[PDB]
Design a protein around this motif. Structure first.
Motif, PDB file in Angstrom:
ATOM      1  N   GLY A 184      -8.752   8.312  -5.508  1.00 23.07           N
ATOM      2  CA  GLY A 184      -8.788   6.872  -5.253  1.00 23.07           C
ATOM      3  C   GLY A 184      -9.558   6.452  -4.014  1.00 23.07           C
ATOM      4  N   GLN A 201      -8.349   3.597  -9.728  1.00 22.44           N
ATOM      5  CA  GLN A 201      -8.119   2.215  -9.289  1.00 22.44           C
ATOM      6  C   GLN A 201      -8.916   1.835  -8.036  1.00 22.44           C
ATOM      7  OE1 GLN A 201      -3.508   1.615  -9.756  1.00 22.44           O
ATOM      8  NE2 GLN A 201      -3.897   3.773  -9.311  1.00 22.44           N
ATOM      9  N   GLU A 215      -3.817   4.138 -15.474  1.00 19.49           N
ATOM     10  CA  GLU A 215      -2.592   3.720 -14.759  1.00 19.49           C
ATOM     11  C   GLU A 215      -2.099   2.336 -15.162  1.00 19.49           C
ATOM     12  OE1 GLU A 215      -5.293   5.366 -13.554  1.00 19.49           O
ATOM     13  OE2 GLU A 215      -5.075   5.533 -11.398  1.00 19.49           O
ATOM     14  N   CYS A 216      -3.001   1.516 -15.702  1.00 18.51           N
ATOM     15  CA  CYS A 216      -2.619   0.186 -16.175  1.00 18.51           C
ATOM     16  C   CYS A 216      -1.951   0.240 -17.549  1.00 18.51           C
ATOM     17  CB  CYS A 216      -3.813  -0.775 -16.165  1.00 18.51           C
ATOM     18  SG  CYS A 216      -5.087  -0.437 -17.369  1.00 18.51           S
ATOM     19  N   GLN A 276     -10.778   4.105 -15.413  1.00 21.34           N
ATOM     20  CA  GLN A 276      -9.994   3.222 -14.531  1.00 21.34           C
ATOM     21  C   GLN A 276     -10.750   2.861 -13.238  1.00 21.34           C
ATOM     22  OE1 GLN A 276      -6.951   2.119 -15.714  1.00 21.34           O
ATOM     23  NE2 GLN A 276      -6.490   0.836 -13.939  1.00 21.34           N
ATOM     24  N   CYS A 280     -11.058   0.055 -11.599  1.00 17.46           N
ATOM     25  CA  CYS A 280     -10.343  -0.888 -10.746  1.00 17.46           C
ATOM     26  C   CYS A 280      -8.824  -0.850 -10.981  1.00 17.46           C
ATOM     27  CB  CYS A 280     -10.864  -2.292 -11.010  1.00 17.46           C
ATOM     28  SG  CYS A 280     -12.659  -2.534 -10.852  1.00 17.46           S
ATOM     29  N   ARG A 281      -8.060  -1.596 -10.185  1.00 16.09           N
ATOM     30  CA  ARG A 281      -6.597  -1.546 -10.305  1.00 16.09           C
ATOM     31  C   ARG A 281      -6.069  -2.174 -11.599  1.00 16.09           C
ATOM     32  NH1 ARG A 281      -2.715  -0.540  -6.283  1.00 16.09           N
ATOM     33  NH2 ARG A 281      -3.253  -2.021  -4.625  1.00 16.09           N
ATOM     34  N   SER A 282      -6.356  -3.460 -11.784  1.00 12.53           N
ATOM     35  CA  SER A 282      -5.836  -4.225 -12.919  1.00 12.53           C
ATOM     36  C   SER A 282      -6.684  -4.108 -14.186  1.00 12.53           C
ATOM     37  CB  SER A 282      -5.675  -5.697 -12.528  1.00 12.53           C
ATOM     38  OG  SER A 282      -6.918  -6.260 -12.179  1.00 12.53           O
ATOM     39  N   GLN A 307       3.809   0.632  -4.939  1.00 10.57           N
ATOM     40  CA  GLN A 307       3.461  -0.495  -5.811  1.00 10.57           C
ATOM     41  C   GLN A 307       4.707  -1.061  -6.476  1.00 10.57           C
ATOM     42  OE1 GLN A 307      -0.087  -0.490  -8.314  1.00 10.57           O
ATOM     43  NE2 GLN A 307      -0.407   1.681  -7.823  1.00 10.57           N
ATOM     44  N   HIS A 347       0.828  -1.205   0.000  1.00  9.40           N
ATOM     45  CA  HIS A 347       0.000   0.000   0.000  1.00  9.40           C
ATOM     46  C   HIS A 347       0.869   1.265   0.000  1.00  9.40           C
ATOM     47  CE1 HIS A 347      -2.412   3.244   1.915  1.00  9.40           C
ATOM     48  NE2 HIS A 347      -3.381   2.757   1.161  1.00  9.40           N
TER      49      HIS A 347
END
Ligand SMILES: [Mg+2]
Ligand SMILES: [Mg+2]
Ligand SMILES: [Mg+2]
Ligand SMILES: [Mg+2]
Lengths: 360, 369, 369, 369
Positions: free
Chosen positions: B24, B197, B243-244, B220, B222-224, A87, A84
């Protein structure tokens, strides 16, 4: 009830036994009960994986203020806290993670392998590198290793495919039918040349190891090559492990602790691959007694039937990072059975810490 | 021939204009830590470059990793020809793998020098001026409710026609602020809801379903990438991936899946202007709309962005932004200008920006000879 | 500021140096027809570019098509700024779709002008000198064993370690051609069997099966990609794709299938130096070994090839070619040089080539502002 | 036994009947440039063909490309048997690769000669009259509510039941055009919104979502197939693919994905009547609804269209079009007829059209045996 009270980062030079120097990063964590944990990251070359020696400092300068006061025994809480804070940068989180496992082991009165599920392998098999010399001299040297318990050998290749073909063809008829050879290119070959190599040696039983940089180049080599393939530096986490299993894209997955982001993730990736009946190698990139102690516990908790080998990383350097660590007996690597990692820092070798954070 | 004679690294604090910038799942920045790289040469041409994160855990990038990289790389970069940008790229990539965020300020400085040596703005060397004034967006951060009705009328009269709603901290109240912001928009306008994310996949789906009758851009969630594709199974809204989008490999996956309606290109997340350019050119050749951007920063980071935006075809450029205006403090003298909601690059040679040495103070690191 | 003031088109015959050149399924070239574009500007900078096919049926390209495009586009290109190569590319693509070979000489003239305007060789503008001297191949050859050994030893002494076996007219005697040549090569030497799209799929498979014990590069055995993939199911030899590599689209699917060991990049087949560069860069970032070349031509075509080659990473550049040295006549004054079996680009501003106006003759077309 | 003795190329202006013709993302055709090929034989049988683009940038095709192909291929076609249409097809394809639009007029002229030599209309040679009067569409209109009602009432009474809305220049007001036009037509009727490659993928999706409750045909929303498939992820409307349908390979891709509800077949976009017939028959066998037409043009192009339509199974033929009636000038004498909103092919031998030599003027090129 436990709290981290002090974090120190140490840096030391580790020169290679046959000649040239790797830069070690040791993290030492103190607690309010006086339990001390240590962990190590040492690269073998700064360009070798997505990892370098200065990145531990960087991560520590951000994270160590946030890690004071927290409970190190809770390894997964510490894992998620670090993940956290920044990354990725797993190589740099890895020495902290190991130190947390060392503390949990001391607090529980158990070695790290017990907390990893038990001793599933009593003495991890080992390999010997090379030899790169005369025919009668390689024959004498392989006989010295053989008498001493070694049955696996690593042909170091990957700088010139054409002479690498010669190295493989010269070594293999010099070893017995019970014996393994891995030609490790260390991401070295271009895809066309790796294929030329594979075609030229198709009548040979050896392990083809990380012929090219990326997974996709390796699978392109695999389209032609029948040799059992071993994937190493591209095995960077569970995501990659999932894709390898889905493709059935290797016969062995090499698991380096700091490349996987520390012992916590490395264990989870191993457990995942064991459950999918994928043979594994349990190791790390490089290092002394503290990095090697993590390796030996990692190998000891891997099922004997699926563990290809491990390595005595500490025996490749003339200098030390830690006091104690794992041992070698008859060509097998043995973990400690005493609580924690079974290793304390070698403060005489390490010097003054480059950085120090403490609670008031 | 040209040689790199000196490399210096500077660090400074860039406080945020409004106070707190909520993004976020509960994150906030009051001060961002800038990293500025200054490259001197033997003909007296000086280049500069900047990485500044918006939050240390926003992408695979943190401010301290620039120093770590420079300690490794800068000794080996001395005496090299900085105007051969792709030689410098592959040298930096031979020295260390990954850590593109940290190479990004060096890469910018190299492009800057090349522009000076050629007597041309960086947009010319990136192909020319394919967009005269990149359209801009104004991001309304995570705050109250009845006050955004005045924020819009402020930015509407200022020339802006694109607005970012910051969401991602609580899907349930996020539904409500999407639903209350959209009827405040006018016909010729756009809104993106950026979760940064922030949502868990099941909650991003709930949001997508509760706002299915609405025209906005889902950014974006979610994270992935896989999580965002799982949301896309249900969500019909144009999706923007940010960001991905880490580079060309991800760009290839997105194109292969036809997996987004907008791809956001943050220079340092792509690993510098060189890789950002190549990922941009790839997506455009595949007729994917793009945003030309970076994470955060002052004038030096904003100069790179402006030239990035100016060399993007206007048919495929959604927006860009004035990063230097988000801060109370500076990194550079010069940089881009804004006029009526569009971002204009400099036309002078190089990046059109010099280091603000007074703001930056003494260098934290200095390699020479 | 710069404006195009004059566009001229030239046409000239380039006869082959050794009488008749046999490629593919029985096809023969004795004279190739060059098209040269010459571009004047208001500040006195002149650019030039060339497309010359080997055969008129060799790719989706022919010599008369350059005229047809210039007749449509050259009135529309006057007054524009030729330094902005990506603006010119987008404009040409807007005026017509496809016909990349015809846009290719214009694109090379625009890069030339940009070079001159910046005081830099075209390789600098393509990223730097990433390969100092591109490796070359010899085309050889067809005689007795002792005469083959002698001619290959002279090439070996001249610095050549790569050899192209012209095949594709008859799979059965092509098998023998391959079997004869390989044992006369030394360890480390590359041999490419270039069928130039010539084999029917079943016959290519027969050849692959009868030569499976052999180390050579199997090159473009069939016309279409799908056909080559059907051969690849049986053939373990490294596969080189050439004439089917028409652009980024095809590049992307070669990468997705991991469909070849080498991709051959002909500038005019890719639609000009601008698109060729971008396909190069994509393939290199995907770690695909490449060949940097063109179909055929004189010094102007060859100058572009050499800059394209010089800005390709040495690690992944398989070879390039000296196209100008295959002809008895010239399109340009200057161009690349050959040293110890390697192709060297020029280091002076632009392409480093000016039109050979005496050899070219009077322009077939002339558009002035 | 028969021989081509003479080939002539004609070029003429076809002004648009209603001034300017707005299509796509900001294009307009006022005058279209026709290319007519005339083939003479030793038995005195003459055949003619035509290609006319609807805008030079519409497809991978331009007017000047017919000249260029002819100059290369026509001397090689003298003495050949024109009745053997597949032999002529394969000779052309051997002489040049691709450029099917340029081959298309030659192909039509050979079908014309064959029909004359056999004493049968071209529709008979394409299998028979499988549709007696192809249904037609009207490209109407583009104006006020009062004026659209009067125009749809005159079109209805004239037999028309299908209407094309020309869109693709502004997605936002294209939503409003679709929304205002659809309730102004009765139960039986149909409407297709043709964006003519014009929308960007994100804007096409916004349009799809805004009109997700409406019954219309979404025609070629974006340029590429993949962009169209991305729109189709969201759009439940029947999708019509047009300009991207370049041949059989793309038709195979479309069938494999079941990626359209209607395929539009333009003879010159498919490389001529021979390839056009094969692509249609393949799609009909795969039970895909088709439109049988061509790009643009006069009575010669329209004769081929009408024979193409007449030999299309009526269950699967969506519509065809009266291309000759869009212009104020002619390329031919005769051609098809229109009665009660249906397009009728001729029943006399061959294409049913001769070249209007007076309108065409002097031949621009002339090859004789
Ligand atoms: Mg290894
Ligand atoms: Mg964003
Ligand atoms: Mg070839
Ligand atoms: Mg249409």
């Amino acid at each position: 009830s436990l709290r981290i009270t002090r974090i120190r980062l140490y840096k030391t030079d580790l020169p290679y036994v046959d000649g040239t120097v790797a830069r070690a990063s040791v993290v030492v964590i103190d607690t309010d009960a006086g339990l001390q944990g240590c962990g190590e990251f040492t690269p073998c070359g700064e360009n070798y994986m997505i990892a370098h020696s200065e990145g531990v400092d960087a991560f520590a300068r951000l994270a160590a203020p946030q890690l004071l006061g927290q409970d190190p025994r809770q390894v997964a809480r510490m894992e998620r806290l670090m993940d956290h804070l920044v990354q990725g940068h797993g190589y740099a989180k890895a020495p902290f993670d190991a130190a947390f496992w060392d503390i949990l082991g001391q607090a529980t009165g158990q070695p790290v392998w017990m907390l990893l599920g038990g001793k599933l392998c009593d003495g991890a098999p080992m390999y010997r590198v090379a030899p790169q010399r005369s025919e009668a001299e390689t024959r004498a040297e392989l006989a010295r290793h053989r008498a001493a318990g070694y049955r696996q050998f690593q042909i170091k290749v990957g700088a010139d495919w054409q002479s690498d073909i010669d190295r493989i063809r010269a070594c293999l008829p010099l070893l017995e039918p019970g014996e393994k050879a891995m030609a490790d290119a260390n991401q070295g070959w271009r895809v066309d040349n790796a294929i030329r190599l594979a075609r030229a040696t198709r009548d040979l039983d050896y392990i083809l190891e990380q012929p090219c940089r990326s997974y996709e180049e390796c699978q392109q080599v695999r389209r032609v090559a029948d040799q059992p393939m071993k994937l190493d530096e591209c095995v960077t986490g569970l995501h990659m492990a999932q894709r390898i299993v889905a493709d059935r894209g290797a016969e062995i997955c090499c698991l380096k602790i700091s490349n996987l982001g520390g012992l916590s993730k490395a264990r989870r990736t191993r457990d995942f691959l064991i459950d999918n009946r994928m043979p594994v190698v349990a190791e790390d990139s490089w290092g002394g007694e503290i990095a090697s102690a993590a390796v030996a516990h990692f190998a000891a908790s891997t099922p004997e039937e699926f563990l290809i080998n491990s390595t005595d990383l500490m025996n490749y350097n003339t200098r030390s990072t830690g006091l104690g660590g794992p041992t070698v007996h008859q060509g097998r690597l043995y973990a400690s059975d005493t609580p924690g990692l079974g290793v304390t820092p070698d403060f005489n070798s390490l010097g003054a810490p480059v950085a120090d954070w403490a609670l008031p």
